[model samples]
Target: SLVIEVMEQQLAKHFQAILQDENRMKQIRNEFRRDGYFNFKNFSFLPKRILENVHAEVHALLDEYSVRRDVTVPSTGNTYRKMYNVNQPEIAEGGTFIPALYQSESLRKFLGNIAGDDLASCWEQEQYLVTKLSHPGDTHGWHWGDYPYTMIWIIEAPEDPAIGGVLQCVPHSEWDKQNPQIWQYILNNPIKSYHHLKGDVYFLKSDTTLHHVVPIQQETTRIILNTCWASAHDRRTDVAHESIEVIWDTKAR
Candidate 1:
């Protein structure tokens, strides 16, 4: 009863704090509408102490290799792959840190604004919070998903662009259909790209937008914390094996 009550109060305070910032809310909404994504640099919003604690937890939790999913790109001459993938249902349900991160009222409200939904909206549980590890020469091929929105936290990344651990995103308007021709054209054209840092957060429309991780070039491994959400109007999309595999394991993390 004490824990529940404390969490309820914490959640209430979080929502209140977010509601007080009209400018930040407006900026997120406008940028997401215009570019189909919003990125904030050098900002995690969490306190420095909490960030260091969470960062350590993630590092320790990800050391084991029990849960892993390897995926390949559907096209592009089979040039891309999701080498080491792990989701966070267990971690979220396990204890304090991740649950607090996922259930933050401020985060939910921010995502709701992007999705044109109210604060009471519901989001999918599976693959809701996930992490992917990309080693040297590995790539997460370009693909779109059924979820309406996504928030990515760059937990770890390489510093050099030549090492090639960057995210490339194209707006939904560019490729409405799953046509190979359109994919090819966009693959050759210039799209938005980012070399995100540890504290950077990217919020974007996942269902409509196309994105993928550039092939890793250096010896370091890139890690990303990804969260997916759906608004009232968004429906879940079907996934074929050729696209990706959502694997869950209790032994992992």
Candidate 2:
């Protein structure tokens, strides 16, 4: 409880800098007022100055790619590859490389700091809803089925010859209650229309939101920073801070 309270304080302090207007903050704040998670296209509202920081990272990544022409896989092997290349054979076939965001210092700090603001706004607006359904200040990462909110920063780009790596999500209640057929459906019926481009950012629900990518078909890479969100009524604990860590394991597992 103390840790969460402290985190809330830190979030409040940092949020003051990122938030541009009380009303705009309220608009973001309003999304948390719902029961299910909502995804926003380019919702990162960081000031243009801070936004440029992301651009700098992208250029640096390009430089690194030049030297290490061979994209480096995460320590967990091909977790990301599998996630992106499951049906590439029948669907689109494997392509080039995907860079890891956690590996970079500047990228890591920027994402973390921005996420703090994002979560603060979500909590400020949705805390009431969360409190009614669960605890007032539950954190994240209690287990697979427990957590109010979660976040993951994914840095993936489709390499050469792969045109799209669109993320696709199936309905949450598509199969048996015990086992959702989200990925199964995706594997069986591929969807490549939602492919994205480099520098494009998307926010969505991970737990209840069953999603996957189309395929990479171009020489250029299609990169994305995938962030996850747990509802406002789940446990937010030590694991809350492990959002990025879980992403690493998601790739590994």
Candidate 3:
């Protein structure tokens, strides 16, 4: 997608200026390495020249894939399998359509540079990245055990009064102690939604934080670009949505 190209150009210029600056570079690098999330609120660091272009690019991608990717129906289906997607373009194995690819070409170009060698190993192992287009009444929470890592991009979310998707967690302190209850807490919480915007980009320990999407207003749709990072041990080179390849691959059995 053109998003990566646009963002990389803009983010590069943004990071370049920051890195060259005496005061902000150190702080910026520290924020990303330490927190896993680097939220740039109200396009503060974004270059004025390309801001609108980036925004427009995302809108175009959304327009192209929204109808083709996974869509939620107003049905109270009783199983987790109720979730369905319309796979096209044959991108990923066992996939109807992975929305991220529609915008990934550009997103990855920028992310590739930002994710230095230190983070590269982690990224490779989690080969399959994801982008979620969630709206109100979607499933509440998810737990993938030890499968992957997620980088969430909140593109367009509503503000206060009507809660934007919330993300709650029990610190890594609890995770280090091997607390199952922490997991239980997340699973049990009826709602763990995050407020929209403020450029909140969160790194999810999906294996631990039993996270879920809280019920949103019927009119609102929470759009997030979630990319997965595979472990260093992963090596199949196969596309994600290809159900046939997946059937015979190690991941299938």
**C-alpha TM-scores of all predictions:** 0.76, 0.40, 0.52
lDDT of 3 at 5: 56
Cα lDDT of model 1 by residue, 32-128, tens digit:
8766778766654444455555556666556643255555444433435645655454556443665566666666775686557743323334444
Candidate 2 lDDT over residue span 13-125, tens digit each: 44465454657545454543221233333424333333344445433443332111112223222223222111111111111211222122333343333333323212221
lDDT of 3 by residue, 20-89 (tens): 6746645654654443334555555345445444345444545543332232211211112111121222
Global CA lDDT computed for model 2: 0.31
Tell me the number of clashing residue pairs for each predicted model: 0, 29, 31
Candidate No. with top lDDT: 1
Q: Mind sharing the TM-score for model 2?
A: 0.40
Candidate 3 segments whose C-alpha is farther than 4 A from its true place:
1-10, 20-38, 44-54, 67-117, 121-135, 144-149, 171-182, 185-193, 198-210, 230-253
Model 2: residues >4 Å from true position, as ranges?
1-44, 58-80, 83-162, 171-178, 183-199, 227-233, 236-253
